[PDB]
Symmetry: C6
Subunit: 150 residues, 6 copies
């Protein structure tokens, strides 16, 4: 039951962020209307989220952990892309009369972006260690039973 | 019960994406205001989602798997259309002064679009094989009982 | 319990689409600002959805199937109206400099619109037959008991 | 338990429509920027919904049926006001160059508006009769027991 | 369990109204772009809602009734501020060419605003009396047992 | 079970505020289009919320309290940033013709901002004391059993 709720809640959240972020991001582009980055970033941002949405459709009928990786990976990319997207918007929006201020946007971006990616690595690292920790603990317990068995 | 939750959660998600995507997409068109593609893509995008929404209405009262195909198919089309829609927006929005950058939008589109459709095929293929796998496994188990039966 | 969830989920979805579609549709009209069709379509679209919303208010306290028809009918109309609405937007938005491309919008509309209404008829027809099928099966079973009864 | 779910679901729906409708309606006014009607209708529309939202706050802690009337009444008013609001928008939006088309908006409004209010009266009337029907049926059953009692 | 659902449902509703109202209100200000009131009202409106959102974060981990007062109070303020906000928008939006119509907005505001605040007082008053009523009823019942006790 | 619902509800709320606030805030910037503050505040606001969204993805699979701190901290920052963001918008929006009124926005900001941060400290302080209170009460009860034990 614990696993059932995990997927159910995640499904709603996935479409929640993907749909809204893609919509607002799309509107952001039409409203404003370096150049290549803005176009590519926007297209990729939408595409990545769309992939996640599809995952919501396939997961319902349903190796399971494999797709889980695709969803988390895709969802994560969208978040990074959205962050990159807003950074470009600040640079592009002010790019006309505000170029001086535009720089502060990307400059401040690096600090949070690095921590964003770095934080994920630290968490993943701890998770990896735990898997190994259980691996050693599991075999040991089994060995104890094996020794007393004889 | 497992099946009940699958439909319940899916129903909310369907209207979730269909309603939001259609709304934002519609707003994207009015804000900006090759030419034929933009008009057709927008109209089709909305129509496809509307079909899915109706499916949410008919599924409640309720062969069942058949309609399931219509919903997944329609929902999937909307996602592809939305991706195509944003690609057109980038080309159209910049189409005025930014035509040069506009190309990068569609060019980058192909890469993700191919993977989007290709990924679905791979998943479906594995699903098809599993169905056949169970088919062979099922008859075999039944035969074992039939042999011992005699 | 199966019936309880059906209404509960449907209630959220109804307000979901009706509220969002009406809001975005309304915004679509103010942003842009044949002529008569656009005004009437927009007004009707909003009115139909509003009716559905009210249905959500009356259903809670609660012949039951009768109102169900009103909700499904009203909700269905809104979907058709929204589709018609976007079609008009494409024609009206481009109606200024883009009239040539504007035609493709309504032309492509017919194909999907016909399938949209036609698909509903097919589903309803099957439902009607089932009702009659059960009618014959029900009386037959009762007759069997009546015969053996004597 | 049946009563618990009724309030829980209604609470989410109330804020759902009230919040969204008020937000979009508010945006509709700023975008466009007979005259008095538009200003009053918009203000009243928002105020009515706000009242409903507050009701959601007071109902949680919690005569109960009395407040229920306030919520339904307020929510209903908002729906009627929103319908009136969009009708004004069509008239006002086109009011500049499109006056000829603007008339069709309010004209078509009356038809649906009358049915909207009239339909509610019919449903309420049937509900009132049912209350009386049970009243007569209840006393009759009690009398039967009283007669046999002696 | 009854108390658990009360908080769970309220949490979703709080963020629901606070997030949407703040977002739309913020957009309303940028779109339009007496003067001091508009600036202060908008800032306060957002701030009050933000406070409520934070309350949603603190309540999860969790004297309990005390915070409940803060949430209801903050949420209530936002509703009043939003109502005041729209009133200012009508006056400001028309304030340029539409001054004649702008007045009707604030004038009609007073009527509903007074009833909005007055209605709350009446409800609170009844609640206060009930607390005292139980106080007298509780001691009396206890005294009856004390008398017979001797 | 009590803990399960706490995370489930919080997950939906997190994405709820983060997604909406980021979207509306992003749109607020494009619509309007001291200078440096606006650019940095907007970028940081989005980045902080994105971090929270990712947390929603990692929490599902899942030391637990540690991440809880990151989510609450990140979510809290976004709220403060959003408040700061709107304050800047009022100053920037009016910054053109309305500079005189622009000051009232930031001035009024301080009052609520201080109370916003101060209120959190008071609540946290009480929580800290409670932890210590239980610490003393816990050891005391255990000691009583230890004494009677001998």
């Amino acid at each position: 039951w614990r696993k059932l709720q995990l997927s159910r809640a995640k499904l709603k959240a996935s479409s929640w962020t993907s749909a809204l972020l893609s919509g607002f991001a799309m509107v952001a582009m039409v409203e404003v209307q370096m150049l290549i980055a803005f176009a590519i970033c926007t297209t990729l941002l939408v595409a990545v989220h769309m992939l996640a949405l599809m995952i919501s459709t396939c997961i319902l009928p349903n190796l399971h952990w494999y797709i889980e990786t695709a969803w988390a990976f895709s969802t994560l990319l969208g978040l990074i892309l959205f962050l990159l997207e807003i950074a470009i918007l600040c640079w592009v929006k002010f790019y006309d009369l505000s170029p001086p201020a535009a720089w502060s946007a990307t400059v401040v971006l690096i600090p949070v972006m690095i921590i964003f990616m770095a934080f994920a690595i630290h968490f993943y690292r701890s998770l990896v260690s735990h898997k190994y920790e259980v691996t050693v603990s599991g075999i040991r317990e089994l060995e104890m039973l094996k020794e007393q068995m004889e």
